[PDB]
Design a binder for this molecule. Structure first.
Ligand SMILES: Cc1c(C(=O)O)oc2ccc(NC(=O)CCC(=O)c3ccccc3)cc12
Lengths: 232, 308, 339, 55, 214
């Protein structure tokens, strides 16, 4: 397959500066966009950064609007991220995401490994509860509600889901609430209105435990959900 | 006197015949630039300049007949003079850069393929526009005499500015056109892959457009050089100031009218110099007949046959 | 003394099948079109104009989604376009510079491209790396390809200049079946909607049916005075239409083998380049040497609409499977969608 | 051309299997296309521009 | 109208820029179409410049050259002749010492190709360069076998100048397609020079009508 490993982080001093890199191999770096995504060590998952394929448009978060920049190098097929003035809200498990955006594309296809980076408005969605007890072999549904409905003018509901294996990278489950992804069984499905969404899982076993998140791709912020840890 | 009215008729007439001729060739240029080339965009810029050379001076010479007793505080007359002089100078430089393009495309055809940017020609034209603007504006800066004063028979300083600008606008264009045509002649005397009749025809067309330009603008060049030479004798002129500076102003104003006539219908001069008889004129006539539909042959046939 | 009598037996069998054409059609199509109201003046307007190519375009094909199409040209580009946003997505280079045949898979996974160099190449669109690479080269043939069609994701019919059509399996890279009945080089084919039979037309001024399961011929079609340039299949699966340099579009029924009517008007001296139908029929799109494209009726076969978008030889034309829009393209490097 | 003659005889014999059904049934089929598919096909029966995906 | 549409617009703009760069890079090549017929010295000519059609490329000074050789196509010409409408030069190769071999002499049949290709509608004005072959064996063996109507001297120069004249005589009504006949000995140093001048002058002529002076 492809390798999306990271350079690695450490215990950066508060308000300091550092560089990071996401090593790339076995794909076209020159035609792919790249994302960096927060993940809180205790509990959480948010956004960090963005770079497009041709370096034309670069977006950032609230505190990441300044103090952080990103750059690419196509002859080496590599990515660089310069981080300045790190704060406690800034530091997270920085996951490396690849994506290409076109007609019928499945964004957020592959995810990296992350870093153990610990130092020392906008649209908000929410799930029902982050601790939903389940049982193997029984169908469960977990719902994430959004304040603003995601039904764009074209009629596409902008939504994605993710399953986080214990101590491993997440994998996509369903894109645009109706269509699945590669390497997943049929047991995942999406439903709900444009305001209230839900993901239905069934046939639970010891290979589906983890955390699930509701996405938002309607506008500039890619504000992640609070998340649900599927306990046993 | 009567010389005034026979000259403002013949100046307004050549102005008001220029407007249909210029707008027809502008639409011809616009139709051609749908499939045109770099010389077509040069011709489009020249045609836009010729549209700017429609003629606003005919209004003033009809209402007041010069006399420098203009109405708008001499503020708009200076602007119209600036537009006229800028149009003339840009037209001269446009023929010069057209000749430069001809030279580069002919003698250096191995390396002439680089000039295909489609925007370097308008870049050069815009640069020439900036140069003529920032050359003509210090004349306005020195001419802070916005009160009524003559711009021909003035004192030594502004006449020296006129001498410098006119001498630069005379000596330089002749130099590029002569050098380009001479080196094209040298190349074409060595070039024999084309038939001798066509080579003689293209040499004749080149020398014809050069000679047409020279004879069309020569008397103005001569009178301005004589005025500048008289002014350059700062110790003393050979004849009296009243006797010189075109004391027979009737001759001066008819020479100005003839030079303006030579300067009006510049696309017509360009068409005539390249070829005296072309089928594209017939094609444009057929297209005009198609769009107009003034044949009146089916209606006349109906009027003669339906009665029975 | 032995082949001449056999040819006379062939002529008598052809006369019997022609008597069958003159008895199966008790009233031909043009004689049974008085009741049906004409489609009328269909003033098709260009809702979008697909511009951006460089050289002479030669083929275009529609997807199953009726929203993604593929354009192929002699410049050496296969471009995947969009319906409404007109923003192209995929640009694919070509090993051979000259290419005349292309096909898009019904599922959209693969795309077949082919030139006159008797090489058929197949690329995969949806790949893990996100790019488009050579999935497999078909080859195995001599001459020049003329039409390629996807019977299945792993079964493909090719029709080329060796006077022989070939049904190929991509997995084994070998000819599953061969069809050598034709004597002149073939030009185009159209598969049946049911994907079980196909007709092939050649420069022999004839065409023949072929079965996948048996690999042999089933029915002959003749009547053209010259080479058949283009041929399309009726979506009902019982008829098809041919167009040639004779300026006579013809409608031959697969199950009736009869000449319904020669669609042609004198003012036409131009030869047919492309032929297509609608999802519901009622109209026969066509492409002529005169740059004004023409749309006739599938039944009336009368002047229905004239489209003057292009100023060059109309090269390719297609209808979406939805029957919502129609795309045409010519050597002037421009593609146009009407509605 | 003796060897080609056997192939010609065999292909002509195998092409003698011909189907004989009328084209008026094809007319009924396209009439059904008009009643159902052309009820949704814009070219025969125009649909409003609200449902047009190209406006 | 979101980030996906902006990314699609950016990707389409980048693909358009790469397409325009590839077109500007590929416009520099010159188009030559070789029409070698049988034993017309195809191997000899490809040595001298250095299942389907064969594409060859070579360099002369600062100008590239791309040539397509159509060999053993055995297909109808009319279907694929117009695919080389944009060709700049059309090269024809014909042997001369084959006037004693009849399969209906090949020399008579070779004029039929040249007469037909000249009077075609697609090639109304294209530069045509005809080459020769087997001069030495032609003069060594030599007239009444193939051209008894000439009935002149058997010397090589008078016989050869007759034969090349009949090739250029039957130009039909397309006199704009100037026939650059050349005395290719098949041992000459640079016969591509014969092409090179005969393209670059035409290139100058192809400028002139564009240039407006002629
Ligand atoms: C104001 C003016 C502009 C312009 O607008 O540039 O051009 C002119 C050109 C000539 C004249 N001058 C006149 O009115 C004729 C009287 C004259 O010069 C004169 C007087 C006594 C003896 C000999 C000659 C005035 C302008």
């Amino acid at each position: 397959d492809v390798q999306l490993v990271e350079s690695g982080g450490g215990l950066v001093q508060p308000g300091g500066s550092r560089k990071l890199s996401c090593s790339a191999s076995g794909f076209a770096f020159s035609s792919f966009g790249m994302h960096w995504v927060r993940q809180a060590p205790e509990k959480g998952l948010e956004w960090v950064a963005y770079i497009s394929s041709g370096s034309g448009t670069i977006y950032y978060a609230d505190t990441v609007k300044g103090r952080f920049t990103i750059s690419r190098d196509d002859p080496k097929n590599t990515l660089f991220l310069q981080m300045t003035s790190l704060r406690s809200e800034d530091t997270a498990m920085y996951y490396c995401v690849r994506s290409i955006y076109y007609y019928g594309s499945s964004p957020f296809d592959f995810w990296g490994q992350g870093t153990t980076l610990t130092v020392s408005s906008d649209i908000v969605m929410t799930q029902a509860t982050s601790s939903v007890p389940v049982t193997p072999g029984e169908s469960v549904s977990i719902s994430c509600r959004s304040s603003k409905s995601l039904l764009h003018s074209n009629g596409n509901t902008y939504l994605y889901w993710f399953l986080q294996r214990p101590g491993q990278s997440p994998q996509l489950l369903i894109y645009r609430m109706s269509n699945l992804a590669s390497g997943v069984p049929d047991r995942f499905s999406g439903s709900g209105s444009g305001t209230a969404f839900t993901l239905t899982i069934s046939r639970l076993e010891a290979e589906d435990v983890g955390v699930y998140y509701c996405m938002q791709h309607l506008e500039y912020p890619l504000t992640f959900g609070a998340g649900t840890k599927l306990e046993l | 006197e009567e010389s005034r009215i026979v000259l403002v008729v013949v100046y307004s007439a050549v102005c008001t015949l220029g407007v249909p001729a210029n707008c027809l060739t502008a639409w011809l240029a616009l139709l051609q630039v749908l499939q045109g080339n770099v010389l077509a965009v040069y011709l489009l810029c020249l045609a836009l300049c010729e549209l700017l050379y429609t003629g606003t001076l005919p209004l003033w010479v009809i209402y007041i007949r010069n006399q420098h007793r203009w109405t708008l505080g001499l503020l708009a007359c200076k602007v119209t003079a600036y537009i006229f002089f800028c149009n003339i100078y840009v037209s001269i430089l446009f023929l010069c850069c057209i000749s430069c393009d001809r030279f580069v495309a002919v003698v250096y055809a191995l390396e002439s393929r680089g000039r295909r940017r489609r925007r370097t020609a308008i870049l050069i034209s815009a640069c020439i526009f900036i140069l003529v603007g920032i050359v003509h504006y210090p004349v306005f800066q020195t001419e802070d005499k916005e009160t009524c004063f003559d711009m021909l028979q003035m004192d030594s300083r502004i006449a020296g500015y006129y001498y410098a600008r006119f001498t630069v606008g005379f000596a330089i264009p002749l130099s590029i056109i002569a050098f380009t045509n001479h080196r094209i002649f040298r190349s074409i005397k060595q070039s024999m892959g084309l038939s001798a009749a066509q080579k003689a025809k293209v040499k004749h067309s080149a020398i014809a457009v050069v000679v047409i330009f020279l004879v069309c603008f020569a008397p103005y060049h001569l009178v301005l050089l004589v005025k500048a030479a008289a002014f350059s004798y700062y110790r003393g002129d050979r004849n009296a100031m009243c006797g010189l500076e075109e004391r027979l102003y009737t001759a001066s104003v008819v020479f100005l009218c003839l030079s303006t006539v030579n300067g009006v219908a510049d696309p017509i001069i360009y068409v005539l110099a390249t070829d005296h008889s072309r089928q594209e004129v017939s094609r444009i006539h057929k297209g005009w007949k198609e769009w107009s539909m003034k044949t009146d042959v089916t209606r006349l046939t109906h009027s003669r046959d339906t009665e029975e | 003394s032995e082949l001449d009598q056999l040819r006379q037996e062939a002529e008598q069998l052809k006369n019997q099948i022609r008597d069958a054409r003159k008895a199966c059609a008790d009233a031909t199509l043009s004689q049974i079109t008085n009741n049906i109201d004409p489609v009328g003046r269909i003033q098709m307007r260009t809702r979008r104009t697909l511009r951006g190519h460089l050289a002479k375009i030669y083929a275009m094909h529609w997807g199953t989604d009726s929203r993604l199409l593929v354009s192929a040209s002699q410049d050496g580009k296969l471009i995947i376009w969009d319906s409404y946003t007109t923003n192209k997505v995929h640009a694919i280079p070509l090993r051979s510079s000259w290419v005349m045949t292309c096909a898009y898979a019904p599922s959209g996974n693969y795309v077949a491209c082919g030139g006159l160099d008797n090489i058929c190449s197949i690329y995969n669109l949806k790949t893990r790396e996100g790019n488009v690479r050579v999935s497999r080269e078909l080859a195995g043939h001599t001459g020049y390809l003329s039409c390629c069609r996807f019977l299945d994701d792993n079964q493909i019919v090719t029709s080329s200049g060796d006077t022989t059509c070939a049904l190929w399996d991509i997995e084994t890279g070998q000819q599953t079946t061969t069809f050598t009945g034709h004597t002149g080089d073939v030009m185009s084919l159209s598969l049946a909607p049911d994907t079980r039979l196909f007709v092939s037309g050649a420069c022999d001024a004839s065409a023949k049916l072929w079965d996948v399961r048996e690999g042999m011929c089933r029915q002959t079609f003749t009547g053209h005075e010259s080479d058949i340039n283009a041929i399309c299949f009726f979506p009902n699966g019982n008829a098809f239409a041919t167009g040639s340099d004779d300026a006579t579009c013809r409608l031959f029924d697969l199950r009736a083998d009869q000449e319904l009517m020669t669609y042609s008007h004198d003012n036409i001296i131009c030869g047919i380049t492309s032929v297509s139908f609608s999802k519901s029929g009622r109209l026969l799109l066509a492409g002529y040497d005169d740059f004004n494209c023409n749309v006739w009726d599938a039944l009336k076969a009368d002047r229905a609409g004239v489209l003057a978008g292009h100023d060059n030889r109309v090269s390719c034309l297609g209808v979406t499977d939805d029957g919502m829009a129609v795309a045409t393209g010519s050597w002037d490097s421009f593609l146009k969608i009407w509605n | 051309s003796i060897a080609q003659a056997r192939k010609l005889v065999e292909q002509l014999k195998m092409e003698a299997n011909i189907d004989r059904i009328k084209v008026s049934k094809a007319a009924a089929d396209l009439m059904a296309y008009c009643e159902a598919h052309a009820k949704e096909d814009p070219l025969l029966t125009p649909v409003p521009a609200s449902e047009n995906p190209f406006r | 109208l979101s980030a996906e549409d902006k990314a699609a617009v950016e990707r389409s703009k980048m693909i358009d820029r790469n397409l325009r760069e590839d077109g500007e890079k590929a416009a520099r090549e010159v188009k030559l179409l070789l029409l070698g017929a049988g034993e017309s010295g195809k191997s000899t000519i490809v040595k001298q410049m250095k299942t389907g059609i064969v594409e060859t490329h070579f360099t002369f000074k600062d100008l590239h050259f791309k040539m397509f050789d159509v060999g053993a196509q055995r297909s109808e010409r009319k279907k694929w002749i117009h695919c080389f409408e944009g060709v700049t030069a059309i090269i024809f190769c014909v042997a001369l010492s084959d006037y004693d071999l009849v399969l209906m002499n090949r020399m008579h049949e070779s004029m039929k190709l040249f007469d037909s290709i000249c009077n075609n509608k697609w090639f109304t004005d294209t530069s045509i360069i005809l080459f020769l072959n087997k001069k030495d064996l032609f003069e060594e063996k030599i007239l009444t076998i193939c051209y008894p109507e000439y009935a002149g001297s058997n010397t090589y120069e008078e016989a050869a100048a007759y034969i090349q004249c009949q090739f250029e005589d039957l130009n039909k009504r397309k006199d704009t397609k100037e026939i650059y006949t050349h005395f290719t000995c098949s041992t000459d140093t640079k016969n591509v020079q014969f092409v090179f001048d005969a393209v670059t002058d035409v290139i100058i002529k192809n400028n002139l009508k564009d240039c407006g002076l002629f």
